[PDB]
Ligand binder design. Structure first.
Ligand SMILES: Nc1ncnc2c1ncn2[C@@H]1O[C@H](COP(=O)(O)OP(=O)(O)OP(=O)(O)O)[C@@H](O)[C@H]1O
Length: 144
């Protein structure tokens, strides 16, 4: 909470929050899950697969806030803020997946394919630390 976002990282915060609900629904569709009227895992139907508005707005807001907390954790571990270029921010590419893996909504099936992006071990350990901190947050939630 003591960490405050710089305004530029803050545009990127809301924009990547939209990117995060996109990634969440895309993980949901990568799981090969089914969409239905009722929110039951046992009968294997959930209407939380298509877009953010189809979700409960409070659930989407909590998704946004946990993405915000995840990037605040990224800041807390002390990552130096870096940006490639302004074009890579104004215009992001839209990879197309086949129709089978195409989302029912109008969003791009994924931001861009994992082949061209190789993530360095410096941030690989960074993600591990994110994993421990998220596990600790869930654990204190269970303790509460
Ligand atoms: N799919 C979701 N992922 C994360 N948070 C969610 C999700 N759906 C609802 N929430 C929000 O999270 C809170 C409780 O749901 P949550 O998913 O955290 O619980 P859970 O999966 O039953 O497990 P735990 O209580 O251990 O977190 C509420 O504020 C709720 O609005």
């Amino acid at each position: 909470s003591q960490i405050v976002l710089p305004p530029h990282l803050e545009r990127i915060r809301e924009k990547l929050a939209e990117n995060i609900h996109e990634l969440w629904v895309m993980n949901k569709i990568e799981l090969g899950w089914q969409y239905g009227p009722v929110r039951d895992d046992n009968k294997r139907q959930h209407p939380c697969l298509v877009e953010f508005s189809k979700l409960p707005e409070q659930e989407r807001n909590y998704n946004l806030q946990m993405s915000l907390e995840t990037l605040k954790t990224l800041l807390a571990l002390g990552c130096h803020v870096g940006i490639s270029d302004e074009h890579a921010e104004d215009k992001v590419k839209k990879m197309k997946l086949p129709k089978n893996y195409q989302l029912t909504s109008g969003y791009k099936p994924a931001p861009m394919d994992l082949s061209f992006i190789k993530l360095t071990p410096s941030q690989e350990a960074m993600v591990d630390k994110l994993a421990e901190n998220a596990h600790n947050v869930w654990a204190r939630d269970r303790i509460r």
